Amino acid sequence: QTRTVINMHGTAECLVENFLGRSALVCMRSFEYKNQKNFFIWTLNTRELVQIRRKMELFTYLRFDTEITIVPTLRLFLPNLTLQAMYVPTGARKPSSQDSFEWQSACNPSVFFKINDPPARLTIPFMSINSAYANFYDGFAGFEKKATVLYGINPANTMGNLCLRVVNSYQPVQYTLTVRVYMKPKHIKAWAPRAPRTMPYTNILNNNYAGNAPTAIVSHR
Amino acid sequence: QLKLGNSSIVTQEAANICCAYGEWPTYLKPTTSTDRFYTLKSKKWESNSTGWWWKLPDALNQIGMFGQNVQYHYLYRSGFLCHVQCNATKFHQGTLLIVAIPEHQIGKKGTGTSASFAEVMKGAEGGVFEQPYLLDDGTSLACALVYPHQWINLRTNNSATIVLPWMNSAPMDFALRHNNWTLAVIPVCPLAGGTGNTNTYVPITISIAPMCAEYNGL
Amino acid sequence: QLKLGNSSIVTQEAANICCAYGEWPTYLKPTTSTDRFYTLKSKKWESNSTGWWWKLPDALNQIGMFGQNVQYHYLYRSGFLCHVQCNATKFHQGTLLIVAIPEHQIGKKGTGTSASFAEVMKGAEGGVFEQPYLLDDGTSLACALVYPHQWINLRTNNSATIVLPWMNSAPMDFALRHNNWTLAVIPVCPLAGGTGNTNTYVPITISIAPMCAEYNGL
Amino acid sequence: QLKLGNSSIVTQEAANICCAYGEWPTYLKPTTSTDRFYTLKSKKWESNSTGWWWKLPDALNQIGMFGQNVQYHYLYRSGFLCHVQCNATKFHQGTLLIVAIPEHQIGKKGTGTSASFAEVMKGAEGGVFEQPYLLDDGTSLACALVYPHQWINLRTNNSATIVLPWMNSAPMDFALRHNNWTLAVIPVCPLAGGTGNTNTYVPITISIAPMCAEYNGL
Amino acid sequence: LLGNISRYYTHWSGSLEMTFMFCGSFMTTGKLIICYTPPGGSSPTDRMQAMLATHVVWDFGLQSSITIIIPWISGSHYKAINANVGYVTCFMQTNLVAPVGAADQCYIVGMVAAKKDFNLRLMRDSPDI
C-alpha cells in the first residue's frame, strides 16, 4: 500500500527559522465603496489564523523581525487607486476615520503604492518592550482585582496596528477593495517549546477549548 | 538532609538532581536570609484524584520573609528548587508525573470568558486540574514531557527534584500578578494500595526553596 | 565450469563476460549462502516462436533460499549474472538476441486498460512477446541494442553472458512488486535446422545467479 | 539484560554462572543467527506439583530457525545455556532444584514394557515426574546432586543458570531421536505462599539458548 | 511529539526508542515478552510467533522501565493508498504475582522518542486543525 525508501538528508528543512519564518496570509478584509468609514484597521498578532497560531504556540518565547506584505485587489461591479499603509506603533491613537489627522502624521511610518504596482512590504523590527514575544502569559495586564483587566494578555506583546487607507476612496465606480496581509518572521530565536495543542479555538484573547472529543483525542479503535 | 539558610529538610535523593533545561539558577542597583525551604500543606492522593498545581511566585506571595519582601518590593528575580515527596509503603502502587510548565495559561472548558483572578491565583493552597488529560491548556498530558518533567514511581523512585532557573523574557518581573512557573503533580496511574482502604491518603509533600533571590525597590 | 556457493553449472565461455554498462555488481544495518545458480525450465525454440522474457526479481520470488528471504525480508538489493545456453548441433541455424531491458513497461496492443498483475508477473515460468518487433513497449526491436545486449549465433557463439548491476534510482527496492531488469531472449532469425523436423525443439536454458545480494528486515 | 543474537532476556544474576563440569561449550566440513534465547511456556508451580523436565534437543526440534536447521540438517552439535526464573513475591517460600541430567533414561513404574516415543518426546511442552523422589530413573532425588545442579530458594536466590557443554561419546549426534541433556526443575519443598491462595500460580519461566551450534548436511 | 511534529512534514525517516514504564507495587513481580515485527510481516498473535521475532523479556522484579530501540523506519502519504510499517507487541510471559497487600490490578505507561538519526524533509500543513 506504499513505496517509500527515503535516503538520509541534512537538517536544513527542520530549522525553526525555516519552520516559523515564511509568509502566511493572516488578514483577508474586504471594503465596499459606493454612493467616511470602511478603512482598514488590523492588530498585528499571529493568533488570527489557526494553523500559524498552533505553529507559533509550539514555543513559549520567540524573537523575530516581521515582514508585512500588503497585496491589494480591486473588484468592480481597473483604475490605479492610491493606497497608503500606515504602521501605528502601540500607544498612538488609532485613525478615527478615513479623513483623520492621524494619517497626516510626522511620526507614524507609512508606504504609498498603487494597485498595478508590486505589493508593498515593510520590515517592522523586534518591537516589544519585553526581550521576547510570549505566546502564553500566566499573569494580568493591570493591578485591579476586576474583570476589566483581562487574564493572560501581556501589554508589551502588542506589535502595534496596521491601517490601510484607499486615498482615491471617492471614485465614479462602485466596487470592493480586498486587502491581503502576509506576515513573515525573520531571524527567529525560540525558547521553551510547549506541548502541541489538539482541540479547536474560540477566540484570539483566550485559550478555551470546546472540543476527536475532549475525553479522547485519537479516533478510538 | 538538605538545608538552605536556617530551615532543613530530610531528602531521599538517589539520582542526579536534574536542572530545568540544564541551567543552574543565578542572579544577574538591585541585590537576604529568606532563601529557605518552605514545606507546603500535604495533599491527599486519593484513588479518584485528578492532579494538583502550584504557581510558585503565587504560592510564595504570603509565606514568611519571602512573602514580606514580595509584598514590600515592586520587582523580583528568583530560581526555584522544588522537592516533591509521595510518602507510601512498599505495598502501594502508582505514578506521579511532576511537570514544571513555563507560562501555564489556565483554560476553562465549554465557556467563552477566561479564568478570573480567583480561579488562577490559588496561592499556598494550590489548584486542581478540571481535565488532567488536557492540562487545562488545550494541550495533551501525552505531550506534557517537553516541559521539565520527573517521575515519582511508588516502586524505586519515591521522590522528585526540579531546579527551575529564571524563565522570563525580562531580567526581572512582578510576583503579585505574574506566574513564570507552574509545578503540576499529576497521577498518571491511580493509587491502588489495596489494603482494604485502611489509609487511602498517601499524602504528597511539596517543598519550594527560592534560590538566587533578588528584588528592586525597598 | 562456473560455480557460486554450492550449485555449479558447466559453461562454454570463449569471450570476455561483458558487464552491463561496465559496472560489476556490488552491495553498498542491512547485510548468506543463497548466491547460487538457479537453472530455469528449458524453453522450446520452435521455428514459429516469437520471444521469451523473465523479470529477474519476479523470476526468483519463489526459488529456494532467495525466494524464502524475499518472502521474509521487506527489501532487497541484488546484482544478477544471467547465463543463456541455446543447445543445438552444427547443422541448426538462427540468431538469439539477449537484451536485459531496464524497467520494461509491458504494453498491450489495441486496448485502453494497462496489463494486470497476471500478464506482467509470470514468475519462474516467464512471458512471451505478443509483438516481438515492438518489444511490447511501443519501441522497435531494431532499437533494442541500447540495452545490455548479446548474440547467440548458432555458428560460433552458442552461449551468452550478462552481468546486471543494481539499476534503480534508490539504494534498495521491493522484489514482491518491482522489476528492475527484464531478460528477453528474442529469435531475430527463425530456427532452420532442416533435418526433416526430427527434433525441432533446440531448447534454451536460462541460469540466473543473484550476486552481492543483501536484504533489510528479518 | 542478557542477549544472544537478536533476542534479549532480562536476568537477575547475582553469583558466578557455573558451567556444567567447568567446561565452557565450544564447537570442534561442518560449520548462523539461530543462537538466540527461546523462552518456553510458563509452568504453574502449584503446592501439589511433582516436577517438570525438558529434553533440550527435543525441546528445540520445532522452535524457530534452530528447529528448521534440525529438521533440514541430519546432524548437530550444540552447547545449551539454560536460565530458569521462579517469579514470586517476598511472601512466598519453597525450593526448586534444577538438575541437568545427562542421558536421563525415563523409567515407568510397575510395568514390563519401556516408555514409548509419546511419553519420552514431549517436545516444547515438557514432561512431568510420576515419582519425583525416584527421578523416574530408579535413582534417588537425594543422589540427584552428582549432575550439574542449582537451587532457586524463594529467599535470596530467585533465578538459576546452567551452562551445558557437548556431553556425548561422539563429536556429533542426531537431534530427532537422541537427548544428551534433560533439564529437570523439581520442587524439593512445596510452595507455601499462604496469602489465602489469591494467586497459587507462581509460574516458572525456562529460557534455552543453543550456544556454539553447528550442523552437517544442507 | 513525534506524531504532532512529523504531521507537519510529508517525508520522514529515522530510528525510534520506546520506553515502557511499570506502575505496579514494589513487591509485585512478573514477565512480559515485547517483540518488534519489521514492516510487511503480519503482527504476531501467539507467544511462539513473539519468541521467534526480535524480542526482549521485560521483568518487573529487576527492571522498573525497559527501553527498545526500533531501527530506522520510513513512510509517506503521497489516488491515495496511505502506508504501513512494522508493529510492536507485548504478550503475558507469566501471571502477575502480587502479595495479599498490593492490588491485583497494575498499569503500564508508554513513552516514545526519535534518536539523532531521525529526519523530516518536506513541509506541509497539518490536517489536525
PDB file of N, CA and C in Angstrom, chain C residues 29 74 216-218, chain E residues 38-40 71-72:
ATOM      1  N   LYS C  29      23.108  -1.119   8.611  1.00  0.00           N
ATOM      2  CA  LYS C  29      22.177  -2.065   9.292  1.00  0.00           C
ATOM      3  C   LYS C  29      21.927  -3.294   8.415  1.00  0.00           C
ATOM      4  N   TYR C  74      11.549  -7.471   3.778  1.00  0.00           N
ATOM      5  CA  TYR C  74      10.673  -6.426   3.184  1.00  0.00           C
ATOM      6  C   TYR C  74      11.393  -5.708   2.032  1.00  0.00           C
ATOM      7  N   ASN C 216      16.898  -6.115   4.058  1.00  0.00           N
ATOM      8  CA  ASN C 216      16.646  -5.267   5.252  1.00  0.00           C
ATOM      9  C   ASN C 216      15.332  -5.704   5.904  1.00  0.00           C
ATOM     10  N   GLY C 217      15.390  -6.093   7.182  1.00  0.00           N
ATOM     11  CA  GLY C 217      14.225  -6.511   7.987  1.00  0.00           C
ATOM     12  C   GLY C 217      14.068  -8.023   8.026  1.00  0.00           C
ATOM     13  N   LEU C 218      14.484  -8.649   9.133  1.00  0.00           N
ATOM     14  CA  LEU C 218      14.298 -10.102   9.399  1.00  0.00           C
ATOM     15  C   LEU C 218      12.863 -10.341   9.890  1.00  0.00           C
TER      16      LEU C 218
ATOM     17  N   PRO E  38       9.196  -6.303  11.929  1.00  0.00           N
ATOM     18  CA  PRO E  38       9.542  -5.381  10.847  1.00  0.00           C
ATOM     19  C   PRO E  38       8.395  -5.194   9.854  1.00  0.00           C
ATOM     20  N   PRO E  39       8.420  -4.127   9.018  1.00  0.00           N
ATOM     21  CA  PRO E  39       7.338  -3.870   8.065  1.00  0.00           C
ATOM     22  C   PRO E  39       7.090  -5.031   7.089  1.00  0.00           C
ATOM     23  N   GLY E  40       5.832  -5.189   6.671  1.00  0.00           N
ATOM     24  CA  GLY E  40       5.382  -6.247   5.746  1.00  0.00           C
ATOM     25  C   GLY E  40       4.864  -7.463   6.494  1.00  0.00           C
ATOM     26  N   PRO E  71      14.953   0.100  14.849  1.00  0.00           N
ATOM     27  CA  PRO E  71      15.804   0.591  13.766  1.00  0.00           C
ATOM     28  C   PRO E  71      15.052   1.552  12.834  1.00  0.00           C
ATOM     29  N   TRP E  72      15.791   2.235  11.961  1.00  0.00           N
ATOM     30  CA  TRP E  72      15.257   3.362  11.153  1.00  0.00           C
ATOM     31  C   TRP E  72      14.072   2.870  10.314  1.00  0.00           C
TER      32      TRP E  72
END
